[PDB]
């Protein structure tokens, strides 16, 4: 979301460590936009067992294609109930032009109706607005 979560309960900085207004560290009391991420993470068990891990976020935006230009895609999905499907297709149409997202949705959709006995499709783009949501005969 490109913005650090505002830490809570930060009123008066600890008087046993500087840095807390001494320029160094900036506790995140407010929703600050992130500029150029490169993040660390601590975890210390009470028994004296520490672990750090350094993260490099991926920076990269959405290109300018020529396909979804006038080409409607097919969004399909599967779940456990009419709801689990109704939801995914809802999330589909809200992002009808996000091709990374929809591709991924489709890959998931591929699950035997032995496990996910509920399926549904939708035609994003095109004056279809065409969406069926049915149950699915078991067996092969």
């Amino acid at each position: 979301h490109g913005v650090w979560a505002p830490n809570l309960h930060y009123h008066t900085p600890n008087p046993e460590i500087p840095a807390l207004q001494d320029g160094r560290l900036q506790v995140v009391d407010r929703p600050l936009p992130i500029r150029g991420g490169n993040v660390g993470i601590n975890s210390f068990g009470f028994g004296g067992s520490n672990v750090h891990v350094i993260l490099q976020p991926n920076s990269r935006p959405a290109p300018p294609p020529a396909q979804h230009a006038a080409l409607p895609r097919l969004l399909q999905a599967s779940g456990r109930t009419l709801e689990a499907v109704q939801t995914l297709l809802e999330q589909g149409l809200r992002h009808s032009r996000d091709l990374a997202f929809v591709g991924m949705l489709n890959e998931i959709a591929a699950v035997s109706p032995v496990a996910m006995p509920f399926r549904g499709y939708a035609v994003l783009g095109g004056e279809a607005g065409s969406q069926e949501v049915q149950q699915v005969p078991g067996s092969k």
């Binding site: 505002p6 009123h11 008087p15 975890s43 004296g48 490099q56 976020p57 890959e107 699950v111």
Partner: protein, 280 residues
Amino acid sequence: MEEVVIAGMSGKLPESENLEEFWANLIGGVDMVTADDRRWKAGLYGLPRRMGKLKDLSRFDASFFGVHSKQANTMDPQLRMLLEVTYEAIVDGGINPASLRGTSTGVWVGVSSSDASEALSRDPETLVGYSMIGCQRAMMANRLSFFFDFKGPSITIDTACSSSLLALQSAYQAIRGGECSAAVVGGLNVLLKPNSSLQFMKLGMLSQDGTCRSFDAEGTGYCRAEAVVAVLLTKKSLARRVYATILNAGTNTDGSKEQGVTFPSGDVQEQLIRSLYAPA
């Protein structure tokens, strides 16, 4: 030798059913810690009124996971909602869990407390023997490997408060090194037995306040909360989504501090932070 990336994530957290609920709270600044008779009673034995509590704990989709109804009422609720959050996480990152069936893929679970397991072993003649296939710690990972068909390492680690992070480390390494192509990294902790907390208070690491005053001069102690959470690690040349990339990790251990075992030795945490930066 290989590049390792966090390609899947999901979990349930205090007053949050799914990670989008858990976002609302974060941004909107909403103390997910509350005062409920949810786990136990309004303030038993002197324990603080506040805890970070999972919305529901009793839900689970039992058939999909193929578990005769009885054998499911003897399943540690962690394990239950682990089976779900890790599916939710595998699919979170554009992969079909089935495309993994039979990998050299591992599972690494950070678990400290398996409260549920004592719960279902007290009653001596009244106790069904398959509780342990649903409660023994190892089953936290093993039974997660069992269902997804992940033939690589299955392992639960207990290092206390760290664990899940050291699991997510232990995992990263195993991918990096050739061993695997993907990992399930899980963190589990559910509050059931009040005794536990009572001990923690008798050590004064418990905030009567019932809050985590993160950097404020008035820090008493912390405020225990639960969570089942899982991320999916994968080599780049296999991830359909990338939240971030893991640059490095490592763990050490506070030596013999003269001021007790509970005492967090900073002079040693510094060291750890170094091993991973500047020259190496």
